[PDB]
Each structure stands twice: as C-alpha cells, then as structure tokens.
Write a protein that binds this ligand. Structure first.
Ligand code: CL
Ligand code: CL
Ligand code: CL
Ligand code: CL
Length: 499
C-alpha cells in the first residue's frame, strides 16, 4: 500500500525535521466538501489558492477558498512565537489549522501538510485517498535565515518554464532563496539594454554548442514574480572578474588585447578575466549591476569572484575594491564566493564558502577571519552540497573533482561547527548549488538534485538537536513513493532504505 497507505504517515515524518512535533489523538480527513478558510486578505487567499491547486488534481475535490465559515482546513495569520517564517499546524477530527504571523509561515505550513498527506496526493487524476493527516500539533521555526538553492543556467540554458519547475522542486523543502547563476564562460543569460550583444551574442550558445538562450527583462521579472509567489527571494549572480568569456566574446573592447575571444562551449574554468587595467571595464560593470539591481526586488546581488585564475592576486584585490561599492550604490547587499574574503569584503557583505574538507588551513582561516570581521557566511562545501557532484564513480552525470558525495556525506555535518575558528553566529545559512556543465534537461537536473536537495534544506531549517543520519534516512526513504508519483527522478542511493 505504498501509494495509498492504510494509515497516515507519522506526524514527525517530514523534511525538514520540524522543531517540535507533538502527535496525539485521531487524524483529520479531507473529504469532498472540505473548504479552505483563509483571512480576508490578498496574501491569505494567495496561500489558500496555492494549497487548493496542489490538492485538486489528486483529490478531485472543489476545495473552495473563502474568508467565511469554519473550513476544515484553516490558514490564519495571528500573533505567536513563529517569526517571519514559522508556523503551527494543528490536526484532528475537527480539522487542520495552520497558524503563522506571515504568509511565508502559512506557505511553509503547507509544505509540511503535503508531506503528511499520502503519496497519491502527487497524482494528476482523482485518487481514492484516504486523505489523512496525522493528529497532533507541530510548532516549527527555521534555524537559519539563508536557505538557498542555486541553478546554473549559463552552462546549459533553461527557459522560464524549466526554471519555474525547478522552483517548485525546491519550494517543497522550505528553501527561501533562489540563487541564479546568470553568466559564465559559456553564456550570458540576462538582457542588458546598455550592452545589447551580451544577450544576443553572448547568449547565442552553451556547453556543447548549438542554441543557447537568455531571459528578456520581462521573462526575468516573471521568474522573480513566480519565485516570490513560492516565497523564494531571487539572488542574481553576474560572475566577475572571472568566468566572463560570454561578455568578453561579445565586446572586443573589454579584452586586454582588444580582441574578442571565441564563444566558449567547453567545460573547463579559470581562463577568462575582465581587463582590470581598462576603464571601460568599470563602465561595463556599473551598467550591468545597475540594470540588474533594477530588476531585483530582493536585498542581495551576487558578484561571484570565483576562479579568477587569469587575474593576478593584486589585480583581483584592486578589481573587488572598485566594484563592491557599485552594489551599495544601487541599493543592494553584496554577496560573493569566498575568494572575496581575500579582497576586503565591504561592510554588510556575505561570502559563499565552497571549500572542502581538504582545503588548506590558510584558505579556511582567511574565511574565518572575514566572519570574525562581520562578514556573513553562506556554507555550500563542494564536497557536500554541490549537487552536480557524482554520488559514486559510476554516476552517469555530474563531476568528480571534489571527490564523490553520497547522500550521507551531503547531510551528515553541522553548519555551526563546520569551519574551524569561524564564529557560529557568523553563519547565515546554507546553499545547494546545481552546476550544469553536464546537465541539459529538467530530468537530469532532478536526478542530480534528488535525493540530496531535501537534506541541505534540513541543515538550513531544522534544529541541531534533530540532526541524525540513522533517523533522517528513514524520513528520506519515505519520499520515494511521493517522487515516483510526481514523476521526479532521483538516485536510489544504497545508503537509504527506500519505501
Ligand atoms: Cl515539484
Ligand atoms: Cl523585455
Ligand atoms: Cl576547453
Ligand atoms: Cl578546468
């Protein structure tokens, strides 16, 4: 009865593990007449409609969303110790009630509810159910405020609809930030009016050659809007001064030798660099960041700074000293890969650490020192949360430069004590980056994203006290029938006792 269990799934069997789970009494059962009661506000109804849309196909129920009556499923905004993202979920014969201070909390409560319901809820045609929700109470709040997933649309381009699909994948686990790697050596994916060729030429191809692609301003705004409706703050990234071949290949003048390199379709890194000794370079950067910031309602702007191996140390430091201020100039907070920690991060900046267990002490110290100086840390170790890394030597897709990363390794660590000497309070959260040198379609993205994606979300959300591989793998194993019913391909790791 994998698809439709006789009894409801345990109240604590959800990912991320809830802060507090108190099971008790009989469960709630959704029946044909169940109404979704929300507050009389736009944001409230919005979450109600989102929930109704998720349940209608599989249940075949009307599930009307209204601001009157005593609906069996109630989403209510009220005071409480839940912060901006927490919530309380009460379930019993009298109905299911999700309480929170803000819509995001209600949205998160919904993500938990869809896991309490049976796997059949993932189907697109009416199913028998039963639509049971274990009885009891759940009180849940996040451990970290930065819980993101990155999608590389530069190596291989993915259109608006494919991005919306990935957004839906991550929304399941309460991620609250979507980092978009909009430019690299193989492509420039965002239209910049002041520099037209970046998109028309720099976005004309991708890894492996052939058609590339890019988002017009309108398409990008639609991605931001859709992400916002899924409570994901979009963090755009324009990598610099390295990983800039797409831009350099579009405008000869940006190159040190004034010659435009060919468009790049390979899968290597570290060979490109903006010309630090040219003034036009900083006019370019200012134009790009200014236009990007205007399309960014979010608080952050990622300027990369990784693998600038064709940029001498002194030039890198000089380049960053000059460009970081451009971000604040356009009202945003700067974010960069941890290489930025070696180039004096400006006040309020955050750095994304992608080091590994084997990384040298000097490099780790430089990052820990930045944390000591007030720089926020986003943890995404290459040998832990890089979703493009192979599970084993036999994985058909992905890379292996950071070694192999099975499910347990990806999950089995604590962000608070991860980086030696780094102040725990400097850790803002975690991120799961999905690079695409080897991925060209949505299904390949799923196979490499799952089943590690949920684990990273837990590290960012759940209390350290709930962290435990032996019990976590049981909760992960339970997702199998849900992913199968949803058509989500995933690596069936031998470390997980799949249900
Ligand atoms: Cl999905
Ligand atoms: Cl447009
Ligand atoms: Cl190459
Ligand atoms: Cl390389």
């Amino acid at each position: 009865d994998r698809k439709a269990p006789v009894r409801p799934t345990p109240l604590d069997r959800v990912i991320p593990a809830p802060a507090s789970v108190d099971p008790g009494g009989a469960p709630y059962r959704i029946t044909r007449g169940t109404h979704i009661r929300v507050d009389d506000s736009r944001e409230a109804r919005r979450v109600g409609d989102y929930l109704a849309d998720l349940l209608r196909p599989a249940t075949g129920y009307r599930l009307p969303v209204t601001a009157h009556g005593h609906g069996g499923i109630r989403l209510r905004l009220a005071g409480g110790p839940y912060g901006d993202e927490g919530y309380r979920l009460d379930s019993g014969p009298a109905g299911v009630t999700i309480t929170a201070r803000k819509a995001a909390g209600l949205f998160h409560g919904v993500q938990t509810l869809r896991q309490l319901l049976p796997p059949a809820v993932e189907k697109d045609s009416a199913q028998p159910g039963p639509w049971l929700v274990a009885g009891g109470t759940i009180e849940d709040t996040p451990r970290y405020a930065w819980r993101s997933a990155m999608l590389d649309v530069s190596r291989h381009f993915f259109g608006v609809d494919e991005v919306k699909r990935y957004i839906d994948r991550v929304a399941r686990y309460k991620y609250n930030k979507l980092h978009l790697h909009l430019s690299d050596d193989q492509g420039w994916r965002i239209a910049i009016d002041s520099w037209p060729r970046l998109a028309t030429y720099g976005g004309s191809t991708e890894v492996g050659g052939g058609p590339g692609g890019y988002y017009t301003k309108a398409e990008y705004k639609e991605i931001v809007r859709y992400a916002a409706s899924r409570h994901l703050e979009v963090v755009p990234e324009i990598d610099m001064p390295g990983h800039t071949n797409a831009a350099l290949a579009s405008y000869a003048e940006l190159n040190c030798d004034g010659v435009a390199p060919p468009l790049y379709t390979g899968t290597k890194v570290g060979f490109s660099s903006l010309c630090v000794d040219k003034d036009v370079t900083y006019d370019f950067v200012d134009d790009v960041i200014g236009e990007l910031a205007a399309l960014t309602p979010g608080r952050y702007l990622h300027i990369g700074g990784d693998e600038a191996h064709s940029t001498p140390k002194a030039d890198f430091v000089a380049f960053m000293k000059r460009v970081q201020p451009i971000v604040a100039k356009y009202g945003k907070t700067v974010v960069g890969w941890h290489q930025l920690a070696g180039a004096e991060p400006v006040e309020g900046a955050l750095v994304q650490y992608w080091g590994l267990d084997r990384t040298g002490d000097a490099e780790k110290a430089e990052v820990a020192e930045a944390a000591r100086n007030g720089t926020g840390l986003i943890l995404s170790p290459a040998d832990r949360t890089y979703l493009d890394m192979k599970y084993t030597k036999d994985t058909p897709l992905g890379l292996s430069w950071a070694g192999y990363v099975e499910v347990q390794r990806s999950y089995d660590w604590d962000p608070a004590g991860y980086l030696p000497g780094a102040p725990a309070d400097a850790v803002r959260g975690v991120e799961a980056p999905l690079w695409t040198e080897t991925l060209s379609d949505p299904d390949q993205l799923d196979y490499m994203a799952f089943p590690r994606l949920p684990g990273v979300a837990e590290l960012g959300w759940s209390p350290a006290s709930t962290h435990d591989w032996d019990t976590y793998k049981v909760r992960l194993a339970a997702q199998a029938p849900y992913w199968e019913a949803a058509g989500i391909d995933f690596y069936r790791s031998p470390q997980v006792p799949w249900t």
